[PDB]
Structure 1
Amino acid sequence: LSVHVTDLNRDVTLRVTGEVHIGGVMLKLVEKLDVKKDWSDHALWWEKKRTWLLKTHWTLDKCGIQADAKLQFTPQHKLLRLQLPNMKYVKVKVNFSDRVFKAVSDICKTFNIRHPEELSLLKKGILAVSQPVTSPEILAKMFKPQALLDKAKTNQGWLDSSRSLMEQDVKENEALLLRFKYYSFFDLNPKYDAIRINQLYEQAKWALLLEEIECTEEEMMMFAALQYHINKLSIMTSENHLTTDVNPECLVSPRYLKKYKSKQITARILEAHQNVAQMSLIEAKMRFIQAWQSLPEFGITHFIARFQGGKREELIGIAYNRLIRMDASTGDAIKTWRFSNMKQWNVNWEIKMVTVEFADEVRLSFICTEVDCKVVHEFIGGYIFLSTRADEEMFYKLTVTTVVNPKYEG
């Protein structure tokens, strides 16, 4: 066996038996290297079969390791460049051993964001602050084609939530996108979700500005006025001074005039107004999200799909309440099936075909790319799992595989 230490950039070849557990090898590593350091975090990684040495209690043989195998001793927590929905990169170190689902959970607990199951990871202080862009040129610089096929192509980058980061080709300090994957936001509470709402509003703002989602001019002007309103509401949160021609003594009962001087009353009102503006700021972003949620093209994830009796590449669209057969160019809905009528769905991994069973004996089938099937399967099962909130074991189970919809009405 050969174990490569990435940190010290040195490879160690060891004499291995086969009756010594994985922990024994790790222990032998600590003693032999003759270096005063901390090895507590590191874990063995197998690049060949792309599996972690998860259980260190296991011996050598029941892991299926041949002779002269080149293992890797690398730290679990590596540098990871994350781009928040606010399009600002933050540097964090997360566990590359845990499942992406549990990884997202930890990241959101760190970022003060409730319900991490609505979020996931996607390939390519200031958590609460939201400000517009310095100049229109930056938007044009960030401007992408954002066509349906281009958007559908980027949807392949959704990580397997049942696997880890290391198993899915994620290098150290490689850019991953933290995005709201599912568009079923349960319990948006301004009392707890000051950051959660802010990032969701940011994702909605950037999706509209970069024309990732299509809307009319009237709606565009409204959204533009909304974040203008949000900007003015934000300024009020910092202001600790009188800004209008109103005398604060006119806003209170005359008994407090005898209890306080004017400077005292002005101070307590300004302090309270910062709290008032703080809630108005949040509820404003709430309205932005509401208007965003009410768009006719909201909450649809596109995947290239081949439908029965179709000679052209089309699109399968996945939403929180339905899935849609769509036109690849226009994006017009050909037919819409709803999740409330679904009994179960099947996934043939050989043919790469998804078959969905609905009520009243209607049946849908389509075919996708190899990578898309796993992503679509997780998208489907994920959306059903989110329709049951009122349990991590439930999610992993829902995500030739056959899964019965636990919310079938019929």
Structure 2
Amino acid sequence: WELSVHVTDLNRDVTLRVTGEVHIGGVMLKLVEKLDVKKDWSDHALWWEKKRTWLLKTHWTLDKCGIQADAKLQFTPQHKLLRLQLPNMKYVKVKVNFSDRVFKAVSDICKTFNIRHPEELSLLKKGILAVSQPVTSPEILAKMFKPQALLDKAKTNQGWLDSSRSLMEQDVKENEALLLRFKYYSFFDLNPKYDAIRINQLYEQAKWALLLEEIECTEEEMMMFAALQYHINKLSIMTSENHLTTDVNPECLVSPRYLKKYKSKQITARILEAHQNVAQMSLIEAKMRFIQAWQSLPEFGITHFIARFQGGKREELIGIAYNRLIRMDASTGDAIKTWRFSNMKQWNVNWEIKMVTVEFADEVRLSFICTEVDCKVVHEFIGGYIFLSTRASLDEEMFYKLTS
């Protein structure tokens, strides 16, 4: 028959006569030949929109791929530009492989951003990494303010991407916007000697969650968080300062032998240069105190999903924490019953009725029903947190096994 291939970046669709015994790499050759151009085809790969699959297996025939007649597939570069909003609510432009599994893509992104442990992060539907700055006006906070209702937060969690599939397979187009967020609330080895960016973004996600009231806290706690912010800002300013700003003479801070080795001007300089390193360390530790306080909030580390339980009168919530599963009321947010991860044996998903079932120790079983998309997201969340419990180079295959 005849194959219709659209070369995206060239804006040229090409008709190609095929038999079906022709291989994948063969179509790509007939494609290049008929185009008669001098271009680097290194990053280009075949894509089938109608069935949402990449065709990366070069050796496979068109029969094994099950490509029918009048099939209109695409020939597009694997790497495309993606708009990412960081936890600091700033947007960044990155090029990423749209063929790679989201999990791999996230790790490559984090490696670029110098963010350790990318397994804690993922993508969510709707220099710059280092510095934390307060907003200019309360107006902005009011503008960015969200409904923040519990049932709406559950609706948001439908957008967590499948870590076992690629961006292109999940309706993500080039130049579109995605949210880079800390998905799992179990942070392994937060080391300030290596995680300057990792901690800053984690602190930002914490700061914004409180400023926009995604997580609740008492008035006393709110003022402490605000005080910590003010302190962090002052400590941040301290890092850029290379000038004496107090009444203390630097020559009183060193042993008398350095007054003979150096001028007063040079000692003052080397102390200020050393001070910026101290202020930089005080800055991170202050942000770490912010995070550990945010970690101790009673409503911390829970991800909400709309679900129906065996004897439910309405739509309820299934809460996923690092250590437990929680049956919650959607109107009050109060826990109806809690199950521990420590007593979990096996969890399975019936995709026919869209029902997730988990059997625990003491022979008590939990089952509930979600929508088709939530079933996949909830399943990955459970397997993810369990994969995170094994932490003590990550085994990506073990992750894919538990999550898929």
TM-score, normalised to structure 1's length? 0.96
How far 1:317 moved relative to its partner?
0.3
Cα distance in 2 for partners of 1:68, 1:314 equals: 47
How far 1:35 moved relative to its partner?
2.2
Cα distance in 1 for partners of 2:291, 2:228 equals: 10
- Residues 1:126 and 2:128 aligned together: yes
- Which one is further off, 225-234 or 59-68? 59-68
Q: Which residue of 2 aligns with 1:22?
A: 24
Which secondary structure state, in structure 2, belongs to the residue aligned with residue 52 of structure 1? strand
How far 1:31 moved relative to its partner?
2.3
| Cα deviation code 1:171-215 (max 9, x no counterpart) | 111111000000000000011111010100010011100111111
Cα distance in 2 for partners of 1:17, 1:305 equals: 49
| Cα deviation code 1:62-99 (max 9, x no counterpart) | 11111221110111111211100000010111000000
How far 1:262 moved relative to its partner?
0.8
Cα distance in 2 for partners of 1:156, 1:18 equals: 39
| Cα deviation code 1:291-332 (max 9, x no counterpart) | 000000001000011112111111000000011001101101
Cα distance in 2 for partners of 1:363, 1:36 equals: 63
Q: Which residue of 1 aligns with 2:48?
A: 46
Cα distance in 1 for partners of 2:114, 2:33 equals: 40
Cα distance in 2 for partners of 1:130, 1:57 equals: 50
- Residues 1:397 and 2:401 aligned together: yes
- Which one is further off, 182-191 or 359-368? 359-368
Cα distance in 1 for partners of 2:152, 2:240 equals: 41
How far 1:360 moved relative to its partner?
1.2
Cα distance in 2 for partners of 1:119, 1:269 equals: 38
How far 1:126 moved relative to its partner?
1.2
- Which one is further off, 23-32 or 137-146? 23-32
List aligned pairs for 1:259-298, cutoff 5 A.
Answer: 259-298=261-300
| Cα deviation code 1:324-382 (max 9, x no counterpart) | 00110110111111101111111111111111111111111111111100000000000
Cα distance in 1 for partners of 2:381, 2:142 equals: 31
Aligned-residue Cα RMSD (Å) equals 1.6
Which secondary structure state, in structure 2, belongs to the residue aligned with residue 14 of structure 1? strand
1:337 to 312, 336, 339: 339
Cα distance in 2 for partners of 1:87, 1:35 equals: 42
Cα distance in 2 for partners of 1:51, 1:126 equals: 35
| Percent identity for Structure 1 against Structure 2 | 100
- Which one is further off, 190-199 or 28-37? 28-37
Cα distance in 1 for partners of 2:142, 2:237 equals: 27
Q: Which residue of 2 aligns with 1:148?
A: 150
How far 1:114 moved relative to its partner?
0.5
How far 1:18 moved relative to its partner?
2.6
List aligned pairs for 1:336-375, cutoff 5 A.
Answer: 336-375=338-377
| Cα deviation code 1:212-232 (max 9, x no counterpart) | 111111000000000110000
Cα distance in 1 for partners of 2:206, 2:14 equals: 50
| Cα deviation code 1:105-162 (max 9, x no counterpart) | 1110111100000000000111101101010000100011010000000110111000
- Residues 1:73 and 2:75 aligned together: yes
- Which one is further off, 389-398 or 252-261? 252-261
How far 1:37 moved relative to its partner?
2.1
Cα distance in 2 for partners of 1:126, 1:46 equals: 36
Cα distance in 1 for partners of 2:58, 2:216 equals: 51
Cα distance in 2 for partners of 1:136, 1:189 equals: 33
Cα distance in 2 for partners of 1:40, 1:366 equals: 47
How far 1:30 moved relative to its partner?
1.9
How far 1:61 moved relative to its partner?
1.4
Cα distance in 2 for partners of 1:34, 1:392 equals: 41
Which secondary structure state, in structure 1, belongs to the residue aligned with residue 6 of structure 2? strand
How far 1:289 moved relative to its partner?
0.4
TM-score, normalised to structure 2's length? 0.97
How far 1:17 moved relative to its partner?
2.7
Which secondary structure state, in structure 1, belongs to the residue aligned with residue 51 of structure 2? coil
Kindly tell me the number of residue pairs found equivalent between the two proteins: 399
- Which one is further off, 381-390 or 13-22? 13-22
| Cα deviation code 1:2-52 (max 9, x no counterpart) | 111111211100121333321121122222212222221111000111110
How far 1:265 moved relative to its partner?
1.0
Cα distance in 2 for partners of 1:356, 1:60 equals: 41
Cα distance in 2 for partners of 1:246, 1:137 equals: 40
Q: Which residue of 2 aligns with 1:301?
A: 303
Which secondary structure state, in structure 1, belongs to the residue aligned with residue 275 of structure 2? helix
Cα distance in 1 for partners of 2:170, 2:368 equals: 26
List aligned pairs for 1:133-172, cutoff 5 A.
Answer: 133-172=135-174
How far 1:255 moved relative to its partner?
1.4
Cα distance in 1 for partners of 2:93, 2:282 equals: 31
Q: Which runs of 4+ in 1 moved over 6 A?
A: none
Cα distance in 2 for partners of 1:164, 1:11 equals: 24
Residue segments in structure 2 that go unaligned for 5+ positions in a row: none
Cα distance in 1 for partners of 2:336, 2:21 equals: 61
Cα distance in 2 for partners of 1:353, 1:70 equals: 36
- Which one is further off, 26-35 or 88-97? 26-35
How far 1:165 moved relative to its partner?
0.5
Which secondary structure state, in structure 1, belongs to the residue aligned with residue 64 of structure 2? helix
